[PDB]
Amino acid sequence: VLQQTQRLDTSQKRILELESHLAKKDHLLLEQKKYLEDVKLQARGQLQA
Amino acid sequence: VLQQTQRLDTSQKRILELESHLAKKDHLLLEQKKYLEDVKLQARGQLQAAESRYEAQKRITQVFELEILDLYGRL
Amino acid sequence: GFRGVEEKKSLEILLKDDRLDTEKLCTFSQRFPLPSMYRALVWKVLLGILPPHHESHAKVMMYRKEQYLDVLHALKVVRFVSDATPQAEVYLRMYQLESGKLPRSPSFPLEPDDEVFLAIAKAMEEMVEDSVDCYWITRRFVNQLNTKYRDSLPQLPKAFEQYLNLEDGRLLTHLRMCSAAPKLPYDLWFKRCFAGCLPESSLQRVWDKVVSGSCKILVFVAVEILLTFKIKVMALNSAEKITKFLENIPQDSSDAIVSKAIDLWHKHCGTPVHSS
Amino acid sequence: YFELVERCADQRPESSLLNLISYRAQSIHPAKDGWIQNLQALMERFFRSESRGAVRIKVLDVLSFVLLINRQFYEEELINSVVISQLSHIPEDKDHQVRKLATQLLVDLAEGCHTHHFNSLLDIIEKVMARPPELEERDVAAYSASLEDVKTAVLGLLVILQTKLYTLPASHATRVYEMLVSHIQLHYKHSYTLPIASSIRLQAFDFLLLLRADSLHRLGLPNKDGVVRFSPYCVCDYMEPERAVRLGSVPYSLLFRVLLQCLKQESDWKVLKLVLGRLPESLRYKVLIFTSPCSVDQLCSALCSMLSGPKTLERLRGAPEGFSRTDLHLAVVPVLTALISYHNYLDKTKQREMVYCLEQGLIHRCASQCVVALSICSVEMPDIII
Structure with a gap:
């Protein structure tokens, strides 16, 4: 549990x-x-010009 | 431990x-x-493609302009 | 109050950005007058003569000058124009050539569209110093009348009849008793955009708004014309007399006419609001 | 020229509009200004306000190619501007080819779309899947093709689920699973019978029954090589929605419930042969049944009542020409054999019925399975095997 x-x-x-x-x-x-x-x-x- | x-x-x-x-x-x-x-x-x-289009049409109008100036000169 | 300084500095901030926001410039042109030194620039930008990007103005003005000189030289070559030809007629012939509507010879009488363009061109000459800039501003303005407002301008006479009553009903009643309402010079006001009716020093204040999308400013300019001349109009007593007076109004009160027409258009169509 | 063709489109031949659409498609890529608006205009004119089938198929294929190329970068912009705005009316569309191709497009698009517009694409797929009193014997086959868009929509949900199970946000796979299951249940609510609906049920159940789960509650599916990949985000577990990485509650109870209805109501033997063929393997994973509001009692009841009564053979169709009660025994006995492991979670009346079914199987060709099963029943269910 502690490792996890x-x-x-x-x-x-x-x-x-x-x-x-x-x-x-x-x-x-x-x-x-x-x-x-x-x-x-x-x-x-x-x-365009 | 399974959930963890x-x-x-x-x-x-x-x-x-x-x-x-x-x-x-x-x-x-x-x-x-x-x-x-x-x-x-x-x-x-x-x-530059548009520029080339413009330059080509400018040259075409240049040929026609010289034709117009010649034809007017002959009048 | 130094509100002129605030307007000028706000426009200079709008013009400082490497990309000019045409929407913000339109909203400003609605809400405020353009300083004369930036009017030609802002009109060019809103008319699409110059694109939003400030970097592109040098090359695009080269393009505009090349196009102007090419069309002008072509008109010289086919002898349609000459050095004696008035600048407004030169612009008219350039516009006809560029739109493919050039007649066979200049001796062909002008069409109504030609006279309308000629009137706006004459008015533009007094507003815009540079001939290339003046031509481009003129052509784009007239093209806006034929494209951006082809449907809006015909509605303008009715809007005049509405707002005229809404500010002084008895005045429109005075006009309709003369049955002169359809004989008022709407072609001058709304096809020629008061070109030749107001001095160009104050017609430009109108045209700031016409460039920035508002042709109702024309309606309110006419309304303020008739409100300013209430003393004269209520003494007018014939349809033809009214028509002739309205085509040759005294020009002294024209600055106040356009100022109060802008005030009236800000009162009836509201103050423009900057977008969030 | 193509502006002119557009402004006289109604009067043109179809090939002319095909050329116009190809030209406008050339105009549609991120290099060209307003390409999104150009695509939206082409879509409006020639899909939304055009009624010719080939023209709409071509514009739909243009949209498909535009998405195939430009979903790399402009997927969200295209979905918002064009796809949701134009294909949303596909459910009401009258062209069967166009609807089928449109749900194939919406499916292929939603498979990869992991943004918040996946819900919007599933809206259109769902409304397609949300789909007569008079039919003539040959007109049945002609009409049948009018539902292939439902087929591509649900087979598309299979592909979408096989992708979305392993990808966040987990609500996507949750919705796909709910749509796939609630639709395969709509089949039984409406008692659909057409061969299209039969194949839809077969394929959907074949995919659904392959949902495995490990000890970590994680759902899993096989790859092309048949190797299971367990999902790091989607878990079989029941979460009440009423009053950390968010986790996908994909509870097995929904699929289990429709398996109950498949046992109770299905008529197509090709489906039951599959559901009964894959139920034992699925029943191995007690994590699936126990973690969700599944009801093993209903499962045993469905199987036992299937064997006990003749009504199943009066309900079945499409079974092999010699199909008999013995064949039904051969198929259900495996499920009961696997169901013995749930003895502590079965009502003893159901255990008695299940033992009775296994005992009844000693007459048929599955005698070996029944004897083996009954041996385990002896060890596991002494108070009812007595």
Whole structure:
């Protein structure tokens, strides 16, 4: 039981770390999505001219 | 002990899944950066394609302009 | 109160961003006047002459200047225009060429659409210094009239008849007793957008709003025209006399006319609210 | 040109609209501005407001290809903008090919979709599965194809469950299991009889009976190689929803209850041959039955009453031409043999009936199984084997 609770606590903390890291990755993906939207908006903005 | 072992295994497989998730999101971010650079490159290609269209039509109008100036000169 | 400073600095903040938010610029243009130094820029951005991204303005203005010079040189080549041709007629011929509606020779009489564009072009000349900028602003404005407001402009006369009563019912009753309501100059007010009716120094305050999506500002400009001339209109007594007076209103009170028309349009259609 | 074709689409031949859709599909990828809006417009015009079958199939295939390529990055945006907004009317759709292909699309999409839009995709699959007094002998076969979308929807639920069981959030597999089970129970509520419904029940039961569980309550399923993978998130255990990593309560009682109804009401022998063929193996896992509101008493009652009365043979259809009460004995005796292990959890009247069924089996070709079973009954059930 003691070994399992040490491992439970460490793995739950690791999960929280990984979830925060994954949230950061998702935020970066959303930012790059709107960066591509911005990029192609600029590109068609002078392609239309 | 069964519940505790189950809680660990949920967490430990979830760690492997979350690490594959972080790896996959990093690889998706990399391929997305590459795709943004490719759409930026296609932007240059399409802009220069439009420029070439304009230059070709400009030359066509140049030939017709010289024809018009010649025909007017002959009047 | 230094509210002019607040307006100018807010617009400079809206213009500082590497990407100009056309929606925020439209809302600002609704809520406030444009400072004259940024009017041509903001009109170009809202009319789509310049795209939202500020970096692209140099290359896009190169494109606009190239297109202007190409169309102008083409009109010179087919001898449609000349150096003597007035700048407004030059813009009209450029617009006709770019829209494929150029006649066989300049001696062909102008169509009503041509006269409307010519009137707006004449008004634009006094507002926009640069010939390329003036032409592009003119063409996009007239194209907005034919595309963004092809259905809205015909409704404007009825909106005039409504809001005119809603601010002074007895005045519209005075007009209808003359049965002159359908003979009022709606083609001037709403096809030519008061071009040639108001001095351009204050017609530009109207056109700020017309560029930013509001053609009801035209309705309220006409309403404030007739409210400002209540002393004269209530002394008018014939349909033709009213029509001729409304096409040649005194220009002294025009600054106040447009100011109070914007006040009336902010009162009846509410104050614009920034989006959350 | 294709703007003109779009503005005269109603009058065009179908191949012209196919070319238009291919062209617009070219226009739909993340490199092009407003590609989501372009796809939404194509979907609206040529699926939502078009009634020709091939054109809608082509636009549905365009959407399928767009999802196949661009679910890498834009899955959520596409689902919100296009799929939920356009395919939601598929249950009311009148084209059978279009409905079948649309639930195949929604299924293939929901299998991988682990966002909070999986519930929205299962909404459309469910409303498809939520599906006559007059039929002529050949018109039965022609009409039968009008339900293949129900088939692809539920066989799609099988694929979706085989994926979603091992992936969070665990409510996804929970909903798929509830839909699969409540639908295979709707079969008995409505007493469906068509061969499509028979095959649906067969395939669904074949998948469902393969749900194993380890000592850790974790559910499991075999891979292609037949090796069981136990789920780290979905557990057979009953949780009351009334007043840490969240865990998927996938209680075996729902599947068990519909197994009871399959024993009591099924008519297709190919299904009972399967349910009886896989019940002994499933009954090995006492974790399944005990951790959920299962009723072993009802199970023994179903099997014993199946053997005791002739009514089962008056209920069965599609059995082999020589099927007899003896064949029913051969099939049920294995389940009773495995059911002996639940003696402490069976009512003694049911134990007496089960012992009586095993005793009755000594007449038939399963005499060896009955004698072996009765030996264990002697050790385990002395107060009733006396």
